[PDB]
Each structure stands twice: as structure tokens, then as C-alpha cells.
Amino acid sequence: VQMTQSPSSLSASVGDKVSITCRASQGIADALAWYQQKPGKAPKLLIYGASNLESGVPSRFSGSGSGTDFSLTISSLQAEDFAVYYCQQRNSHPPTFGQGTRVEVK
Amino acid sequence: LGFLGAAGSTMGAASMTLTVQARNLLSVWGIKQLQARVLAVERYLRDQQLLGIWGCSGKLICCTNVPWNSSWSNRNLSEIWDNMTWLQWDKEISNYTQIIYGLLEESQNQQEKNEQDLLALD
Amino acid sequence: LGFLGAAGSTMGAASMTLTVQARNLLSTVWGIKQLQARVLAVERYLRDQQLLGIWGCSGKLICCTNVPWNSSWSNRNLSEIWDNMTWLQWDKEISNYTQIIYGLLEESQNQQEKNEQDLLALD
Amino acid sequence: AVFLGFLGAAGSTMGAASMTLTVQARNLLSTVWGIKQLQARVLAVERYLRDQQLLGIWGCSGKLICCTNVPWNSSWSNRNLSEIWDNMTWLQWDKEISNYTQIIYGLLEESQNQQEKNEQDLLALD
Amino acid sequence: NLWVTVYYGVPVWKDAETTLFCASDHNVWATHACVPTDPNPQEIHLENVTEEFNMWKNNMVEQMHTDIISLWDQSLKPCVKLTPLCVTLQCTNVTNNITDDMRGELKNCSFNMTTELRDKRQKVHALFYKLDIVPINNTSYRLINCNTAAITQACPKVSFEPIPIHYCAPAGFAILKCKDKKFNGTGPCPSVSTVQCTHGIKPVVSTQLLLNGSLAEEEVMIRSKDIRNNAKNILVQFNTPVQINCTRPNNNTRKSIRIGPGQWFYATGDIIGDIRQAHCNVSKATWNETLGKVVKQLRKHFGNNTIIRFANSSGGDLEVTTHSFNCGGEFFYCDTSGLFNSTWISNNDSITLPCRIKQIINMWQRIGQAMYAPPIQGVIRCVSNITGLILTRDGGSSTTETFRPSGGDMRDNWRSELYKYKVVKIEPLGVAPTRCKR
Amino acid sequence: NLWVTVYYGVPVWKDAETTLFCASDTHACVPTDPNPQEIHLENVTEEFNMWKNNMVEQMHTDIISLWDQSLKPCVKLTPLCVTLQCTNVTNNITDDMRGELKNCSFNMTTELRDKRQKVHALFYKLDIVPINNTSYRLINCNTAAITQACPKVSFEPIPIHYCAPAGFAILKCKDKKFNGTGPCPSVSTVQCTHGIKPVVSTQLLLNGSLAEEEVMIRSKDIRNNAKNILVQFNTPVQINCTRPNNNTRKSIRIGPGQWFYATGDIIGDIRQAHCNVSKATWNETLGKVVKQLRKHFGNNTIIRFANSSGGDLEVTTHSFNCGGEFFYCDTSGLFNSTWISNDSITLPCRIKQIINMWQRIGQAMYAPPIQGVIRCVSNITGLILTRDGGSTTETFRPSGGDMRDNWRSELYKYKVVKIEPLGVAPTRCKRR
Amino acid sequence: DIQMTQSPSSLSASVGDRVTITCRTSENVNNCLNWYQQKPGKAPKLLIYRTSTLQRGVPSRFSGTGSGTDYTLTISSLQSEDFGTYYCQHYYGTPLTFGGGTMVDI
């Protein structure tokens, strides 16, 4: 399954609500995860199962979507949330990732 | 020899073919076969459930802790195993079959399993 | 007490009537529905028997395991479970943890345990 | 999910695949249009019960791994344990042993459990 | 110190009434819906097992009868209906090379029926048997019961040839077969075997004479529910077959007349050559030897000095007064007065039976349903053997007993085959005392 | 010494044929959709054969059964096999359409069983045949039972997922180069197939799956001139099909609540139905097909495309259902090239209302007219081609008509297997 | 077109003699050969299909074998009903072709 993530050049202020979306070339039910990668750092898993949040991740992050249409919503984009976000499916082998959305500070 | 081949044999000799009979219990013109298949399965499962609740699951010959009551049959072993068939026995004790089953349910599972449940701590 | 008569009894008292419920799990218009009812009853009975088989509990109504109880599933003591609670209340309490327990019964015993018995019976 | 991991070990060695016996077991049971569905459901039930009956007859009821008293005959397979458990998968094994499967099953019934149960009947007797 | 020991797989059974299915090695009986038969059927002798059999209460007969009715109905259900033919017919006599006996038997009837288009009508003709036509009042005729029964045309592609049906028990049940060569239908059978399925029973539908099927192993068998009750039928099973050669000598054609969208009515068209009466032949010596055997067996119940008389049917439905049968799709009604005409007093050549043919028949005596048998092209010859008789006694108590042919209840035909079988259920679970303690 | 050890839950399976059930999201199928999840079978190489795949025969049988159970309760057009008095429609007719539509008058039975009424309808030339005079009848109305489709039942294909009964599994071939037969080194196990659209078409495969990498040429025996070649595209070719006429629906009551839906009249100009494909895209697609065909027929072999040599209209033209109307498009403009080692192509299309689908004897369906103007866009995802056979030049022509070859073009990566959970193997473990 | 050479073109044998007829093809037909018996004035009667499968209703006297490009029809005992012209036919592709035909006379 190929994953397309957009927008690739999102920018926002430290107080804005943002939404990053992606599309699967095939329906994958809810077999999707979202990751956060700081420059020079290990990616962190934020969301699994499309709608489920990991322990250690604040309620600020929320996932939604099913089938082919998925999104990640950040209710308030604090300074620690400017990172490359990735869309990843595990519905069919091999695992695949989207190209990533780099969230910039205006 | 063969399915029900021992039906005319004595109970002792007939007890050696339990797999011969057991293996033949599971295996217009469309719905009759589906009902026949479902019936065979339900009868099989009712007998397996009885074996389960008596602590006899997975066995064709199962020893119990229920004593034999002479009121059910006062014959000795020679006249049951060597000089009698299973059809005759089934006829002779049909009136007591449910009594025996009740006793098997009570002492071979309800009491025995709680005793085993307690012996697993002490 | 008859079928489900112990439903309002405490879990302890209700555990001595397991055969009462077990005996009642197997037994155009009105014809089709009867056959569907029979097939459904068989499938659900066997689903439970399949799980008992996988856990090493085949042929038993009370089955002890090698899986320890995790206090996060319930932190009640035995006097607050077996003596002062019903099975309906317990089922309400253990809902979110049923699949975790079943997975542990499947993995920690009758799989690892059977390999261990396979090795123990080797000598 | 109950389906998760189903047949994942199919390409694994027989030893490694023997650690997943519950994964492939838990997925075995679960108008003419209506009749076709009932036949499929009944068939799944019949196949499950036939395999469980065979396990009962062999004295293996309720077990995923069951040890027996039937010696292995080198005419069935002369491979050693490393070749079978570490260097072979279950599909390859089945292809090799399918010609002897009915012989082995016949021995499992005739050469042990019918004799073992009749002997256990006499050991609990004393 | 005896203890209850539970045994599973015990060779015990009880009488049971269950659903049986079929096996067989298109046709009316939908035999393609049967499972394959066992290539090597396993008949297992139950040595030292004596069972009580009763062919008169055998539930396999009622179940087979029900199956035959249901198969018949689903076979005709998708076939062309003949309601457009319940119209006034204008009929004249066929006079083309007709014999003295075939005078009035076949009528050349014209009628107005629609054609390829719904508005266009054509005058069409067909040759119908006298027995299929009833006068309306002047040459105006109608088809028999065309307004009181729904006549369904049989599909010409669905064969009426009996195909053996093997009745098979559900798993957990078994069929017990009586191997006693002298078994008279009721009572103990000291030689019993268990089978997976019955032998192949051909669903042959006939009256008076039992055609094809099983012969007695040693001697003619006289079986009755109560031999002293003259209202009961007597089933006579032959030990030797009597060959009966039946023919429909006319060379018929089939005239296919459009009746609906892709639907045709098949009329008898014209007859090629001359018109002669259908008939059946039996050897006089074979038949007389067979009756001598039947009389010798009847005297075992009636007295060694009693005169045994055979006579024809006293009356009733055509299907009963005559020998009804089906050869190649044609339905024959043969006059057996030449076969049952003798007096046996205690102390080469052939018999020709005239036969009538019908196209509109009503099998199983159902109200509101009838079937039209489509014409069979060419000339029909069939050779069947008689394996038994259905007889009825006059009684009326005299030193003489009179036996007449009977029939019409097809259960008796199935019963004549399903007499050595009973269905039982297996009771594999049981208990017995042993000294073994858990 | 070694002893027999019995294992239950063994990951072993044998090829099997079994009845499959359908997941969806009709009433003959299961609702709630299948789970997409698949389990990868690492190191499992499985032999597949798309030409021996029993799943194709069941899908074909089930599609026919669903069709028959969809038309059964609909109005049967039996009182319409009457003489028609047909004249040509001359109202705003273009050169192409002269004689294609006729205005036919007939006497139809009204709701009262003792009364008749005179009604008229427009019919396509292909749906009526002469009696000898202006007298016409509906084609094959006396040799087949024509059943009117219910106008409320759509013919739009909806994806159907085929699912294994418990105890069985569907293995999927993930090898992007899998050519329909032989070992597949990358296999996964699924409970249900992907959503397969029951698209009915000939010559061109519409709304199907695309090749993952490059155009695939699949044939049972590429060297057997009599077999079909299924060409799977790696890019879609868009085809825009239209029925430009603005038609009305004339409801004629024929029975106790049973209506015949006739073409009433046409508003405005009468123009022929047609389909457009981009000329450049089609030429690029054929260049890819030729590139792949030369891998079997030789690098120096000339690949020629030609139109169908003949046969039933359903196979000489591109047959498809566009918005409820049945189009028969002339593809001679698409398969007309010789390959030696922007603009559009317009395909005229005929339309029929009396459809003999699956080529059965004694059955036909009447497609009610669709009101307004029809315009559908489809993706061509493959071809069904045949070779002419008996030097240095090969000629390929469009084929089809057997819908199994269409289903087979989707059900090529799947096989059904039976799980064999029991097995025996030597170990040193001894009982007791 | 696949050409078919059938040999002998004419064979003389009496009743009870064993008759073998060979059909050699110019290309491999993958065991897609049929054998037919044509009596004068009648359409050919199918004897054997798919190289060796006997047509129901044909007596066991006729048997066939072969592979590749070389196929043989064997008549174990020539009877009075078996005289006539024997043809081989290939269905491996298009066109379907027939051999020249061997006439079996007295």
C-alpha cells in the first residue's frame, strides 16, 4: 500500500489548531499509526489504530479516519510540536510510510 | 468385526470395538441432508457433554467413584461381561440409567472438581 | 435452583451449579428459523469448548491455570469477590480485561506448558 | 484480533512453528443462498469435530502437543531431528509423510490407546 | 466392590424414525442431487443378533413415498402448463390404415390456439387418445378434466426411466437388513446385518404386477399384513422373473406447436404407417409355472385342499383395473384379464394383453393436478420382468378362494422392496459395573 | 529411538474447492465489509494457477444467480409479442441515425381484461425484426421469455468480497510479476478478497485493477492460438461514453400494477451514442502492450492490431452498461495499427434494450429506457485479445463474451486452501 | 497452419489382423489429437479424443497413444465394421486440421 501525506509544507503559529492528512492507495480499515520526528532525533509513535493515543502522549494529539482517509489533529500547536509527522500503514506487508509533513513556525 | 459387528458379542468382547462404533457417529435431497448432518452433530455433542460433565472427556472407557447399587442389577461380573450382550444390559437397566447419570454428575465432577480445586493449594 | 437460578447468588454459591447452566447450552417459515437456531446453538457451544481446549481446560467446568492474577484487572480480595459479589457484577467489572486474560491463558499455558511437558516426558 | 498471526509460521521451521499452535487453532471454527451459508457453517463444525474425535481416539483430547507410545518407523521418514525440526517446515513435512499418515493414525488407535485404556482399567483396579 | 464404568462406542441401538437421504451411482427423481455411493458398500453381518422387523409399519416406506411425491412435483413445476388447451375441440375418427380394434381409440382433433404472436391465432391439429377426451355435449369435445385439474406438460428432456435410489442413514443411525431368506415381513429375523444404505431401489410405478426389482432368494413369498383379513393386500414376491414384452407398435411423430414465449405444446402429430393396438406378451409356460408356485404358497395359509382361483380386477380406477406402467415415457394400461383367469384344483406360446395408452394422467390420486405425457417419437418396445404381484382376496366366507389383482397405492410397491430394512439409532453411551475405581 | 508426536494447530494446508460467502458494505451477501488485514507468509512459496481457479466458477455462478433473482419479481413482457406497425423516426435525424429508431404502434391490453388500447413506443432497430408491410415484432419475443428489469434496481457494479468458510483460507499472491501460473514467492493469507466490481464487458476490461509495475500479458497457453490473452494495464485509459439523446419514459400499464416502460419520445436532436478515448494515451498504451507481446513473439516480430473477425454483437463490439443503457461500441477505430520493430478516437455505439446476457436459451431481459442524457467515464484497465495465427507478423484482435475471463482478471492472485490442523512428527518424547 | 502426415495412406488387412495407423504432425500439438472413422457416405465417427481417451460407445478394440508430434491408433483385431477411412485431427490452436486419411480395405 502506498501512502500519500499532505500538505508537505504546513506552517502555523505556536497557538494554532492544525490538521495533517494522508491517503492510502487501498483501504486499510484502522490499521494506521502516526509518528513524530524531531530533527536529529528518533521518531516517536503518537497514534496507533488510527484513533488510539499512546501512553506518554498528551491529549493535544488526536487521530481520526478510516478506510483510505486519515488525519492527525493538533488542537494547539505548541513549540514542541514542530516536527516531521509520518503516516504509516500496517495493513499489508511490507510496512510503508508517507513522505512526511514538516510543520514550520511562521 | 466392523461397525456394530460386536453387537451380538458379549459385553466383554464388545468393549474392544468402542472406536469402531465411536468413529461412525460423525460420518428434496438438499435440506434433508443438512438436517441429517445437524442432527448427527447435536446427538454427538449431547453425548460428549455428558462425558464431559462426568469427568470422562476424551475417553471411551471411564472409571468412576460411583459405587454400583445392587438395586440396579444384582448380577455378578461373570453374568454381565461373559454371558451377556450390551443390548441385553441396556434393556435390563434402562429404568436406572438416569439415576446413574445423576450420580455421575454429582460425584464425578461437582464434588471431585472442588476437591481438586482445594488440593491445588494444599 | 434450576437454570440461571443462581444468577442472583454470590459467585461462590453460584460456582456449585455450573452443570445446571452447562446442560442448557445444547438443548418454510418456522422451518428455516428452527434450523438456524440449531446451528447457532452448536457454533456458540463449540466456540466456548474451543477456548477451553486452547487453555488446557477441556472436559472441565472449573479449571485452574498458571496465569497469575494482575491487580490492575481487579484489586478486590477473595471475600469481596466470591462471598459478596455475583457473576453478573463480576462480568461487568471484568470486561476490558477479558481479552487480555484469554490471550495470557492461551500463551502462558497449554502452549509453553505443553512444550514443557513435552520436554519433561522426554527423560 | 483472533485472525492476527494466522499461518504466520507456515514458512517457519517445524520447531518454531510448534510455538504457534493456538494461533492456527483458534481460527478453525469461526433460500439456497441461505442453505449455502448453513452448509458452510455446518461443514466448519463437522471438520472441527472430526479432528477432535481423532484426538480423543488417540488419547490426545484437549492437547495441542501430544506424546504417544508409537515408535517412529524409519520407512516413513529416515530424517534425523535436526533435519525435521530445525531445517524443515510443516508443509514440506506433510508432503513427505502424507503417504504414511493413515498408517500412523491406524497405529495411534490400534497400537496404543485401545491397549493403554484397557491397561489403565486394570491398574486402577488393584 | 463394583463401580459404575462409563463406556462410549457401545454397540446398542433402538428403533428410530429419522430423515434418510439418498445415494446413487436429468431425471424426474433428481438423482443428481444424491451423494455418490460407496464404490464397495460395507454390509456387516451381525452374528448372533436377532432383530424384530415389521414391513407394515416400516417408516422408510412412508418416507420414500413422500420423497417420490416431492420429487415429482419439483420436476413438473418448471415445465410448460397446458391451460390454453382447455378449449372446444372438433374431433373426427382416424381412418388411416386402422385395425378393427383401433376404432374410436384415436381422434383427430382440431382447435384454435394462439401462435408466435399473442393476437394471431391458428387452427392446429393433434391426435388424442379416446381416454384423454370427454364429450362436451355434435363432434364438440374437450380434454379430460381440463377445467377441474391443472394439466402440466412434462418436460420432454426429463427422463421417466427409474434410476436406483439408495436410502442412506444419518451418521449415528444405521440401517439393519434382514438376511432370512424365508422372512415373511413381520417378527424375529435371526440373521441380520447392518448397512450404510439400502440396495438400489428403482422407483418403478406400476399396479397389479411388480415390474423389475428384487426376486425371492429361494421360493415365492406371500406377505400380508393380516392374511385372514380379506381387505388387506397380499404382496407376492417371485423367485424367478417372468419376462413381459410390451410395445406401442405405432410409429409416432411429435408436432411441436408454439404455446408461449419459448414454450411448446407437443402434440402426437401424425402416425407413420398403419395404426395397431399396443400390447404386452408373456410366455404361457412361464406364467403358468409362476402361478403354480403362487398357488402352492397360498395353500400354506388357505388349506391344502382349497381351490385357488385367479380372476381379473372387479373394478375401480383405470390405474387399478388395468396394469399401469411407463415405457419410454408412454403410459400403458394393459388388460390383465388374460393373465388372472384360472382355477387351480388341489391334486412355445404367449398371452397377449391388449393395452391402451394415455397422455393425460393423474398419478398419486391428487385433486386439481394432472400431467400431460408428451409423445414419444418412433415405435416403443420395452422388456421388463415381473418380480411379484399385488393380489386381493375376495373372502366372503367355502372350499374356494378367489384372488384378483390390485394396486394403486404405490407404498405397496416401495414396501415390496423396503421389507427387509429397518432404521435404528445408535446409543453409543452406556454404563456397566466393573471393579475399576477412579 | 523416536516416537510419534501428534500436533494440532499445524500451519499446513492443501488445495481445496469450497463454497465461498460474500462480504459487502444485496441480501445474499454478508453486510459490514471484510477486514482488509492480511498476514504475510514469510518464506512461503505457493503455486498458483489463475486458469484453474475455482473461485472464478463460483463468482460466475453467483453473479448469474443474483441476476436471475433480481429479475424474477419484475414485470414479464409476454403480452408485447404482437405485430408492431413501425415507421421510421424522421424528427431531427442525423446521417448516422437514419433507420436506427422506429416509431412502432400496437394494440396493448389495458388494465381491464376485456378492453384493448392503441399505444406506441420507439424501438431501436436492433430490438425489432420483420415479419415478412411495416409489420415488425420484438426480436426473439416468440423464442425467449423477455423480462423487464425493474427501473428501481440499478445495474451499477458494487464490489463484492469473497470470503472463506472457517477452516479455509484465501492465499493472495503479492508478486508484482506474477503471470497467472507457477510459484509465487510472496504470499499472504486473507479472510476475504479485495472488493471486486462485477463489471460486465467485452473486449475492454473496465474499472478493474491495474498492474503494479508494467503491463501484464497472461494466457493459459500463449502458444495456443485458440486461447484468450488477458492484458492488464499499469495505467488506466479514460473512456468517455455518452447517449446524447434526451429521452422520455412512457409508462404503459399492462397488468394489475405492472408497467411496461417504453421510450416515449426524444426532446431535441437525435444523435448516435459514442465513446471517446484520448488518441495519445491509447497509442502509448498499445505501445506498452506491443513491448510486452514481443517478449513472447520476438523482438523483430511486427505486432498488428485489427478489429474482431466476427461473432455475436456482444463480442464484435465493446459491450457495456452505461447508466442503465446497453452500449455496443465499434472498436475498429481502436484496434487498427501495425507496429514495426491532444486528439481523440471516437467509437460509434449502438444501443439495445433487449439483452440476452450469458447467452442462455429461452431467456432475455428488457432494459427500461433511462430518461435524460447519459454520460459515463470508465477506466480501461485491460484487454481481452486473441491471435490470428498462421510469418514475422502477428495479428491481435479483441475477444471476450465469456465473463469468466473478466472475473478471472481480478481473481488471478487468489486461491482457496483448506487448513489441515493435525499432523504427526517424530520426537523423543514418550507417553508416560 | 499445422500440417498432418498420416501413414500408411492405404492399408490392406483381413478380419482379426492388428492394424496400426501413425499420424506425424509438423509441430507439437501437446496430446490434442483425435481419431475418426469415416464410412462411405457418412460423417466421421469419433473414435478417440485427447490422444488416448476412448469415446463412450466405441468398443475397447480401439486404443490410441503418442506424444509430441507422433501419435498412433491401434486396432487390436480388425472387424468387418472397422473398414473405412481413418483420420487424425489436431485441436491445438487454429485452424483445426485433418490428416490425409488412411483407407482400410479388404
Ligand SMILES: *[C@@H]1O[C@H](CO)[C@@H](O[C@@H]2O[C@H](CO)[C@@H](O[C@@H]3O[C@H](CO)[C@@H](O)[C@H](O[C@H]4O[C@H](CO)[C@@H](O)[C@H](O)[C@@H]4O)[C@@H]3O)[C@H](O)[C@H]2NC(C)=O)[C@H](O)[C@H]1NC(C)=O
Ligand atoms: C424395467 O427395466 C427395463 C430395462 O432397463 C426397462 O426397459 C428399458 O427402458 C428404456 C427406457 O425407454 C429403454 O431405453 C430407451 O430405448 C429407446 C429405443 O428406441 C431409445 O430411443 C431411448 O432413448 C431416448 O430416450 C432417452 C431417455 O433418457 C434419451 O436420452 C435419448 O436421447 C432418446 O430420446 C431409450 O434409450 C431400454 O431399451 C429398455 N430396455 C429394454 C431391455 O427393453 C423398463 O422400462 C423397466 N420397467 C419399467 C416399468 O419401466
Ligand SMILES: *[C@@H]1O[C@H](CO)[C@@H](O[C@@H]2O[C@H](CO)[C@@H](O[C@@H]3O[C@H](CO)[C@@H](O)[C@H](O[C@H]4O[C@H](CO)[C@@H](O)[C@H](O)[C@@H]4O)[C@@H]3O)[C@H](O)[C@H]2NC(C)=O)[C@H](O)[C@H]1NC(C)=O
Ligand atoms: C465505472 O466506474 C465509473 C466511475 O464511478 C462509473 O460511472 C458512474 O456511474 C454512476 C452510476 O451510473 C453514475 O451515477 C449516476 O449519475 C446519474 C447522473 O444524472 C444519476 O442520474 C444516477 O442516479 C440514478 O440512480 C439514483 C439511485 O438513487 C436515482 O435516484 C436517480 O433518479 C437515477 O435513476 C447515478 O447517480 C456516475 O455519475 C458515474 N460517474 C462517472 C464519473 O462516470 C461507471 O458506471 C462504471 N462502469 C461500469 C461498467 O462499471
Ligand SMILES: *[C@@H]1O[C@H](CO)[C@@H](O[C@@H]2O[C@H](CO)[C@@H](O)[C@H](O)[C@H]2NC(C)=O)[C@H](O)[C@H]1NC(C)=O
Ligand atoms: C524465513 O527464512 C529465514 C532464512 O532461513 C529464517 O531466518 C534464518 O534462520 C534462523 C531463523 O529461522 C536464523 O538463525 C538465521 O540467522 C536466519 N537467517 C536469515 C538470513 O534470515 C527466518 O526465521 C524465516 N522466517 C519465518 C517467519 O519463517
Ligand SMILES: *[C@@H]1O[C@H](CO)[C@@H](O)[C@H](O)[C@H]1NC(C)=O
Ligand atoms: C456368537 O456366538 C457363538 C456361540 O457362543 C460364539 O462362539 C461366537 O464367538 C459369537 N460371535 C459373536 C460375533 O458374537
Ligand SMILES: *[C@@H]1O[C@H](CO)[C@@H](O)[C@H](O)[C@H]1NC(C)=O
Ligand atoms: C440403592 O437404591 C435403592 C433404591 O433403588 C436405595 O433405597 C438404596 O439406598 C440404594 N443404595 C445404595 C448403596 O446406593
Ligand SMILES: *[C@@H]1O[C@H](CO)[C@@H](O)[C@H](O)[C@H]1NC(C)=O
Ligand atoms: C453369578 O451368578 C450366576 C447365577 O445365574 C451363577 O451361575 C454364576 O456362577 C455366578 N458367577 C460367579 C463368578 O460366581
Ligand SMILES: *[C@@H]1O[C@H](CO)[C@@H](O)[C@H](O)[C@H]1NC(C)=O
Ligand atoms: C438473595 O439474597 C438473600 C439474602 O438477601 C439470600 O438469602 C438468597 O439466597 C439470595 N438468593 C439467591 C438465589 O442466592
Ligand SMILES: *[C@@H]1O[C@H](CO)[C@@H](O)[C@H](O)[C@H]1NC(C)=O
Ligand atoms: C477485603 O477488603 C475489604 C475492602 O477494604 C475489607 O473491608 C474486608 O475486611 C477485606 N476482607 C478480608 C477477609 O480481607
Ligand SMILES: *[C@@H]1O[C@H](CO)[C@@H](O)[C@H](O)[C@H]1NC(C)=O
Ligand atoms: C472499561 O474502560 C472504560 C473507560 O474507557 C470504563 O468506562 C469501563 O467501566 C471499563 N470497563 C469495566 C470496568 O468493566
Ligand SMILES: *[C@@H]1O[C@H](CO)[C@@H](O)[C@H](O)[C@H]1NC(C)=O
Ligand atoms: C516399518 O514399515 C515397514 C513397511 O513400510 C514394515 O515392513 C516394518 O515392519 C515396519 N517396522 C517397524 C519397526 O515398524
Ligand SMILES: *[C@@H]1O[C@H](CO)[C@@H](O)[C@H](O)[C@H]1NC(C)=O
Ligand atoms: C542429520 O542428517 C544430515 C544429513 O542431511 C546431517 O548433515 C546431520 O549432521 C545429521 N544430524 C544429526 C544430529 O544426526
Ligand SMILES: *[C@@H]1O[C@H](CO)[C@@H](O)[C@H](O)[C@H]1NC(C)=O
Ligand atoms: C507417495 O506415493 C505415490 C504413489 O502412490 C508416489 O508417487 C509418491 O512419490 C509418494 N510420495 C512420497 C513422499 O513418498
Ligand SMILES: *[C@@H]1O[C@H](CO)[C@@H](O)[C@H](O)[C@H]1NC(C)=O
Ligand atoms: C430380471 O431378473 C433377472 C434375474 O434372472 C435379472 O438378471 C434381470 O436383470 C432382470 N431384469 C431387469 C430389467 O431388472
Ligand SMILES: *[C@@H]1O[C@H](CO)[C@@H](O)[C@H](O)[C@H]1NC(C)=O
Ligand atoms: C408371518 O410370520 C409370523 C411368525 O410369528 C406369523 O405369526 C404370521 O402369521 C406370518 N404372517 C403371514 C402373512 O404369513
Ligand SMILES: *[C@@H]1O[C@H](CO)[C@@H](O)[C@H](O)[C@H]1NC(C)=O
Ligand atoms: C406377441 O405375440 C405375437 C404372436 O401372435 C407376435 O406376433 C407379436 O409380435 C408379439 N409382440 C410382442 C411385443 O412381443
Ligand SMILES: *[C@@H]1O[C@H](CO)[C@@H](O)[C@H](O)[C@H]1NC(C)=O
Ligand atoms: C386431421 O384433420 C386435418 C383437417 O381437419 C387434416 O389436414 C389432417 O391430415 C388429419 N390428420 C390425420 C392424422 O388424420
